[PDB]
Design a protein around this ligand. Structure first.
Ligand SMILES: NC(=O)c1ccc[n+]([C@@H]2O[C@H](COP(=O)([O-])OP(=O)(O)OC[C@H]3O[C@@H](n4cnc5c(N)ncnc54)[C@H](OP(=O)(O)O)[C@@H]3O)[C@@H](O)[C@H]2O)c1
Ligand SMILES: NC(=O)c1ccc[n+]([C@@H]2O[C@H](COP(=O)([O-])OP(=O)(O)OC[C@H]3O[C@@H](n4cnc5c(N)ncnc54)[C@H](OP(=O)(O)O)[C@@H]3O)[C@@H](O)[C@H]2O)c1
Ligand SMILES: NC(=O)c1ccc[n+]([C@@H]2O[C@H](COP(=O)([O-])OP(=O)(O)OC[C@H]3O[C@@H](n4cnc5c(N)ncnc54)[C@H](OP(=O)(O)O)[C@@H]3O)[C@@H](O)[C@H]2O)c1
Ligand SMILES: NC(=O)c1ccc[n+]([C@@H]2O[C@H](COP(=O)([O-])OP(=O)(O)OC[C@H]3O[C@@H](n4cnc5c(N)ncnc54)[C@H](OP(=O)(O)O)[C@@H]3O)[C@@H](O)[C@H]2O)c1
Lengths: 313, 313, 313, 313
């Protein structure tokens, strides 16, 4: 497999390449970055190689500037971690608009070379996955983002821990914006197959305190850290493994929806999809509950607003 | 960890010891059998050792006759595969009664040495797990059997395959007798967390044709095979891994129930339980549907009948 | 990958298919056998499927009689476990001659369909790998056998255990006949890279007692066992993994040698080779010691004798 | 197992904690750092937890300032990555002396709390492992460093790649200073067990060009990178796994030697040792070649010089 990472120099970009180089399926890992951060990549390539010293690996790592993405052709998927590390004076709209030009820039540049899967990690993930789709001019099945996938795993752990059951016995998810307006679906949450609602202990699940932490895990940023390292990479790797192996998992990624959920059209948002060797092979439409769909409505509304301000940058 | 297998000479006993010797947690594997089949075990020990040649392992394999189970003390769990390979003239009651004396025999002999977990594999698994419990005089949390666990995985595969979703995205189970009266619970079956009922395609799930095959997988026996080899061993290993690692999974094993499910008392049957380092740490009681509990009632009735005929052998 | 096993019904054949079905690289596993043992295979297929219940696998298992090997075309490798379970009255020459017709039979039948790698397991492994090569009319790089590979791992364990070092820190091997005339090469035996000879404790290595056990591990047969189950399968799986993944390992398999070792020509014997995606890609010729080559000479002599008696059957 | 990392905030410290938290054997991971970098650790703890989201783990992560190492008691091993990131004006002696006070500081502080294994990563690794030993006042078996272990793996890859053999078929090592004076031992280098010298292609092994790169991999630092990230962490994890599992591997770590190699006394240097549950359980003394021991003599001389300047800081 051939994966390309755009922004392999950043924390997540680095962590992600590391994990991807260890994969048996990784044949050509292309680390792309701007002309001035090319030494940091070659520095990364040498570092990764050390971490692989002793284990079998045919991972060919390549480094290039974001000028001639020619080498990125035939990539099974192209990840994008590029983006401005936010900033004090920066506002949500201010942040949206900025990375928009960065993701779009790459989206377009990529699109010229070929048709590949664009896995958008940079924030606002939804608004950015939207942008990449618009500027890439790709099919809705080729562009998706990390969305609420990690928030979902984060919600899964909390619950499994609350009930004292093996992590695997739980399956839940958060749909909507990968932000304050994210919607947790307890209607699609089972404990060992059994709807969480069929358990007494459920009535005592600190759902609000829990969502609060999930929602605000942007505390990696504030908590003396750049913003995120391994958390994301770990998720990304999973999603890539899902694609290359055509796993057909029912993840919750930021994908383009259009009616699958009544009242939600023309917007990239965190929704359940079936991921396989062809990207977002389906936007699973299941009946939510009264308030879940009301809340899922408001979330998309928020996101759409930004999508407009960005659609033409 | 110290596991003992009673019947390590049979197909399943052999396959199971093989898999268990490869486990990092296996410290002392005791293979027990009758005086005349001791050469087959030492023959097994040497064989397993070959399969381990090249891989790290501190698995001490021991062989002994079923006369002085002294060596089986301090075992974390004792598996029992011993039993008559059924027979043409043999009837269900005829078969029940026979293995009953075999499992009970061991149950009692084991009980004398110490208090351990007794994992009963021999059939009728439910009726035999019941017997082992009665003759072992152990706590309901220390005696359980394979029950409908493999039938559950078997049902899981079929479904995941019917919907074309990753095996992991499905969680379902069959409660009741590990036989013709087994009950599939589609009320505790989720696809990616979503109740299977919330999918249109569900309406077309060949639930009857499917259960038929699961139910009658006693075709290993008839289909030019002794009766089962790896299928079971693979399951057993999982369940053991679940215990040693205190996984806290919500499996469906043959355990002693008593009211957890209204209308079901004094019987060992396939029911959902929370398995950990202390065996059946809980018999999860969830509200079934109208017919699931009606059918679960009839199953237990059947099983109980046999339990009586065996209670004092 | 597409592997075919000829004799999937035997102990090793069964164990091997089990292990191979679990491999991520196994796409189509063809289990071939005679018309009367077709139910035992379908019985095996169903059993294996149970052991896979719960884990991802795209392993398509197929069953067919040894009449129309048409289905075995495009197989990356074809394993052969078919053979007479030896017998009391049977003599080495008697045994050689018999399986010769069986392996040759299949060799020829396979050859007609296509050009594939023939991995010969049945004994006498050397004499049988020779035969399969002769009757298959394949290139010396496409036909090889288990030879002294397991005897080598067996020797490795013994040593590592004698020095009290991690299994991985040892690399040794036995060349020659997979029989009484096998030759252990302590000249190609390192402990952590260091020639075993550079260790004082070496002087006390029970090399003779050790080789005796290795040599006579045909005690699985006598020790109340058919003859071997998992030991072999475990090895086979490794060797197949080596091929499919073009590992380029320096194993010790029964391959066709012709001068690589001075004084050893026109014979299939246990010798060091470089295994990859193209089979025996090289018969590594390293200078042995005075007696190692003298002993390696006698071994080949023995084997050759049988090869003649079989060359035209 | 309880591991403590001193400097969990640095690149290697972070990467290492990540890898260690994923280990099944990791029960309590203590991340220690100075009062001002405590938010970076809690930020790390939250990040790691995200990378673990979905996988089983009982890894309790703890964060504390380097004031009251009370919590670090009962640690199976304490890793030390603390140290000054070198500097332009800084000279080898200047660098040695500085980190000396840092490692020694911690060494002493640790020693007060209890007797544990001190795994010294900070440079100069040899001179620093020496210091930690001196200020910890521990037994020579409890203090060791990364030394030439990664340089050894680095040499292993290069070779295996030069011969086109599976990575596992090679075992070589570099003894001496983890610096310009490092000594490669081709006398303890086997290819598939066979002394590398017994291969013709060996005569063409670019041993000098190769060692040059290994030696100067301090190019991570210069090549737009802090200095090293995953390379080290990957190694460290291995060495820890080696300890917790009492693997008994013959690694090449920076340990205290005293005569094991004639002409080498009172110095911590990269030498072959047997690592197990008790640390450096033996300093393997094998006869080197004429020049290997001459070169190994000069290396130790260099290192000793620094050890003096540091012995009392
Ligand atoms: N999903 C989550 O939970 C989560 C959490 C935190 C952060 N994030 C997002 O994921 C990314 C993580 O960032 P990080 O830790 O990797 O490091 P960083 O320093 O925030 O970002 C480094 C990356 O941004 C690129 N970049 C910076 N300025 C640029 C510009 N003007 N034009 C184009 N590219 C530019 C860099 O490329 P060059 O080297 O070529 O400049 C590099 O690829 C961000 O986009 C962030 O918004 C997601
Ligand atoms: N859950 C499932 O899906 C499933 C499927 C098939 C079978 N099974 C059950 O699992 C077991 C599988 O049998 P198998 O393939 O391992 O081989 P087998 O030949 O059916 O059984 C061999 C075992 O039975 C013991 N045994 C035979 N006669 C005995 C006697 N009179 N007293 C005490 N022990 C006796 C043997 O012990 P000695 O060597 O000491 O005689 C050995 O441990 C059976 O009990 C069977 O009912 C379960
Ligand atoms: N490396 C070692 O140390 C070691 C040790 C022991 C054994 N082994 C090897 O491992 C294998 C063990 O044998 P096993 O457990 O597989 O069972 P087995 O009973 O020895 O062999 C069964 C196989 O032989 C076939 N067969 C028997 N008679 C035949 C005939 N007249 N014509 C054609 N095919 C015939 C069977 O086909 P049907 O079912 O169609 O009849 C079946 O495929 C052997 O091949 C042996 O060489 C290796
Ligand atoms: N084997 C190889 O080839 C190789 C190559 C390169 C590097 N490495 C090693 O790997 C490590 C890389 O360093 P890094 O990424 O961890 O980050 P770094 O910036 O080099 O070191 C950070 C650590 O040093 C501590 N520290 C800094 N100044 C200190 C002082 N004055 N007193 C006490 N502690 C002080 C920090 O504590 P606070 O955060 O509390 O200040 C933190 O724990 C080094 O130890 C180096 O020796 C090995």
């Amino acid at each position: 497999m051939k994966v390309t990472i755009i922004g392999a120099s950043g924390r997540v970009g680095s962590a992600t390449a590391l994990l991807l180089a260890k994969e048996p399926f990784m044949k050509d890992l292309v680390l792309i970055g701007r002309e001035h951060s090319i030494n940091k990549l070659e520095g990364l390539r040498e570092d990764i190689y050390d971490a692989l010293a002793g284990t079998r690996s045919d991972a060919n790592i390549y480094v290039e500037s974001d000028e001639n993405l020619r080498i990125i052709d035939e990539s099974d998927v192209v990840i994008i971690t590029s983006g401005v590390p936010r900033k004090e004076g920066m506002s949500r709209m201010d942040l949206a608009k900025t990375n928009a030009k960065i993701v779009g820039k790459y989206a377009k540049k990529i699109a010229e070379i070929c048709d590949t899967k664009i896995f958008v990690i940079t924030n606002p993930v939804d608004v950015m996955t939207y942008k990449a789709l618009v500027d890439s001019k790709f099919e809705r099945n080729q562009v998706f983002g990390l969305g609420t996938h990690l928030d979902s795993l984060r919600f899964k752990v909390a619950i499994a821990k609350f009930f004292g059951v093996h992590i695997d016995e739980v399956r839940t998810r958060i749909i909507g914006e990968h932000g304050d307006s994210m919607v947790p679906l307890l209607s699609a949450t089972s404990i060992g197959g059994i709807p969480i609602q069929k358990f007494e202990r459920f009535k005592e699940l600190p759902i609000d305190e829990i969502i609060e932490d999930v929602k605000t895990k942007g505390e990696q940023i504030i908590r003396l850290k750049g913003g995120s390292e391994f958390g994301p990479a770990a998720a990304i790797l999973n999603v890539v493994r899902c694609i290359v192996n055509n796993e057909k998992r029912l993840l919750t990624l930021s994908a383009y929806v259009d009616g699958e959920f009544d009242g939600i059209r023309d917007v990239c948002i965190g929704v359940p999809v079936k991921i396989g060797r062809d990207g977002i092979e389906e936007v699973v439409s299941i009946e939510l509950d009264k308030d879940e769909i009301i809340a899922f409505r408001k979330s998309a509304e928020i996101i759409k607003k930004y999508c407009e301000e960005v659609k033409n940058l």
